[PDB]
Amino acid sequence: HLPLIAITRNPVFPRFIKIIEVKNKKLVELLRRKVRLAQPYVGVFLKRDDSNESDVVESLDEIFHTGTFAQIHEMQDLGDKLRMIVMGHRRVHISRQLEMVEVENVVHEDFQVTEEVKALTAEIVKTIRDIIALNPLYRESVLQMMQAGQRVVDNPIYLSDMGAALTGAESHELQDVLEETNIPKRLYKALSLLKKEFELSKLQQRLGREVEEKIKQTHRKYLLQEQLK
Amino acid sequence: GAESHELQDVLEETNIPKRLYKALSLLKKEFELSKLQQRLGREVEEKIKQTHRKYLLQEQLK
Amino acid sequence: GAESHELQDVLEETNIPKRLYKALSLLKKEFELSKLQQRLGREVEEKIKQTHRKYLLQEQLK
């Protein structure tokens, strides 16, 4: 029974640490009000296309129905007066946000043949490795700490959500992954996003190296005219 | 990448030729599985590449 | 890279140490030639970068 939190272009990927700093201070009073609660909590969501600050307060339909309830960890306000640490703990999909009623309906349908499925997971991490090998985004220490071979992958769905989170795909693509219910479908969508970003980065780096080669060839052509000199 | 069960199965055989044959069969099976996964990934990446290069140009503009 | 005449002179030599020493001398002479070849271009580079550094200090003060 809490008002929608102004996301303000802060997509909080599941189980991934994020920080939200909204200019509006009303959220500061909202947070202070829930300090007294022995179980402080906050619900993150995702805004729809054509983000509008006014529409959020005036209309509650702009934010998608899917959401992520999380537990407040600490309040800092080092630089700004509003700075909340948000993570992903409980994923939910509201039947009708306008009408709150929430059902922790976490669909994790899996086959009983848990032998060949992990192979695909392996492929996933391989691509992820390649990405961090060619487009370093985050420290590999998370990779070393979290290894599939250690059997510590208790919830592979969260690991796939990590893999999709590291992707540079738009918020709409992650929304379209979330709406997918079948596990293979969401996995394949995330892998397609991984291939997409891989192609983007490969084209970018190919172009950059070609440009540097062209510049050095221009300098060497200056040298070859220095041969006339 | 064979599972530990396959490793134990290979270790079971006593005669050298039989264990070698089983290891070769395991290698062929794993290679076939890897090739199938690679072909599926190639299919997926070509399907994504079916997206007109206009999107690449728009991202370059951005 | 010695001329054909130098190779002919080397082959003319029958004593092994004579031909070995002649080949070594020819090798070092040819390497001196090639070193001059490449050093002249490296000096092109050296002069260009020295001029760039001088004009870079001029740019700093300017």
Binding site: - | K54, L57, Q60 | -
Partner: protein
């Protein structure tokens, strides 16, 4: 380079050289003027676009 991937350049297949060559292509023209035009076009190609010499050459050719 992004322009090369997608940009205004490389469109309409229009060049000053070719434009002037086609403009005169329909004119019954002598040869001395032809060689003068060839020299002017060679200079224009040599001359950089931003140079005032280039603008004077372009005006004379026009």
């Amino acid at each position: 380079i992004i322009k090369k991937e997608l940009g205004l350049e490389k469109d309409d297949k229009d060049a000053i050289e070719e434009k002037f060559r086609e403009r005169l292509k329909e004119l019954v023209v002598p040869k001395h003027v032809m060689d003068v035009v060839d020299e002017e076009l060679s200079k224009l190609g040599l001359l950089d676009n931003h140079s005032s010499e280039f603008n004077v050459t372009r005006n004379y050719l026009d």
